[PDB]
Design a protein around this ligand. Structure first.
Ligand SMILES: [Cl-]
Ligand SMILES: [Cl-]
Ligand SMILES: [Mg+2]
Ligand SMILES: [Mg+2]
Ligand SMILES: [Mg+2]
Ligand SMILES: [Mg+2]
Lengths: 236, 6, 236, 6
């Protein structure tokens, strides 16, 4: 790999520089190189990995949705035929997005998840696995769509089981996992009631644990609680 | 309109 | 080239799709492929080419400035030594930016400019040549910096001479050329008085010609006149 | 603060 000759610490340093410069493709490539050094990642390093790929795939998802909307309109009644170009270019972006998801899932499988023993790392990586299978599910249309959906569900469920056993209800990783699994239920699994129930129960349990927290921890937890509330307001 | 994830 | 097998019209169509999806690297590659078909570009096609590369190089310039600022701070009195990484990564971004500028200049030289006979195309392409030499000048520090600066100046000057002879003072291409040549004087050539004089004279001549225009042309011209005024307000 | 170009 092109990062094989660079020191692990230099890759991390450059990932932080790329973030400051909003160069997220570079940031992702640097953190991929750091993961491939084979050492476990610290808390800060895990969040650099997540930030980088979340931004890259976020831009690809936004573009895919623009192009998919155009393609769907072109297939309505009374829409003039414009040839294969819209489909081709949507497919190009889709393939690039799938490739990024496959890359992340490959890093998790070789070998981040199997070496992750602490709840904070294991839940973080399993949430990531659920997230990137969810992104694959958003564009899936063929024979393997059900298996992609179930792979997302399975990863989220394992993360949830650990998080409920090992973390307090206000833990930001636990909260963000529940937020995203709730979105999975609503957007992917056609289960809006499950989505709503999960978001409400997560919010209420966290509310009841806020009294245990410092001011700084209270700020971190309430930030994600507000995202659960935003979704509940959208959905009810 | 936007569904929130993190 | 990877676009050699795609129809010219399909490349243009996909450039417009990439713009809608804010995929400007794709947009640039599609328009590079369209230029390399060897036919002249229409007005609309020229603006697709310009939009695409302006966005790509604009992001690179913004990142280069972030990294250059960090590098300059690291070389101040009392700054801890952090190794070669900041310089290396600034150099990486700089090299990529130079490569994009070289690509654009290569398209202009092979063979957009030599086939451009109408004032609207010739001035447009010569302004582009000045712009991308200006972007090279922004990062130049070596033996060829003066020659890069003079290449920008020479292209702008030829465009100005044609625009004053062949276009009315309110023509948006003429106005944007003068805006950018004024920025060249202020930021590149260390000539703030020339920058100010050019912007003022351009603004005043355009003001006096507005009465000849339709409502739509008046809107297009006054938009760029306001940018000249913004710079004059910043500079005086 | 921003210099305008087009
Ligand atoms: Cl394509
Ligand atoms: Cl580098
Ligand atoms: Mg080493
Ligand atoms: Mg371990
Ligand atoms: Mg043909
Ligand atoms: Mg000609």
């Amino acid at each position: 790999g092109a990062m094989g000759s660079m020191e692990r610490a230099s890759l991390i340093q450059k990932a932080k520089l790329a973030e400051q410069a909003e160069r997220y493709e570079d940031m992702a490539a640097f953190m991929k190189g750091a993961v491939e050094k084979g050492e476990e990642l610290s808390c800060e390093e895990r969040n650099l990995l997540s930030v980088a790929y979340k931004n890259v795939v976020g831009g690809q998802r936004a573009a895919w949705r623009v192009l998919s909307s155009i393609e769907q309109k072109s297939n309505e009644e009374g829409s003039e035929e414009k040839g294969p170009e819209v489909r081709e270019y949507r497919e190009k972006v889709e393939t690039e997005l799938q490739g990024v998801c496959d890359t992340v899932l490959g890093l998790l499988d070789s070998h981040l998840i199997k070496e992750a023993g602490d709840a904070e790392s294991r839940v973080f990586y399993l949430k990531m696995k659920g997230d990137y299978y969810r992104y694959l599910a958003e564009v899936a249309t063929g024979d393997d769509k059900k298996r992609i959906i179930d792979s997302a569900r399975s990863a989220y469920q394992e993360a949830m089981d650990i998080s409920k056993k090992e973390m307090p209800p206000t833990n930001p990783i636990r909260l963000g996992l529940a937020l995203n699994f709730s979105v999975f239920h609503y957007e992917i699994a056609n289960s809006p009631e499950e989505a709503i129930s999960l978001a409400k129960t997560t919010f209420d349990e966290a509310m009841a644990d806020l009294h245990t927290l410092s001011e700084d921890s209270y700020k971190d937890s309430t930030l994600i609680m507000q995202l659960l509330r935003d979704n509940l307001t959208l959905w009810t | 309109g936007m569904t929130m994830s993190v």
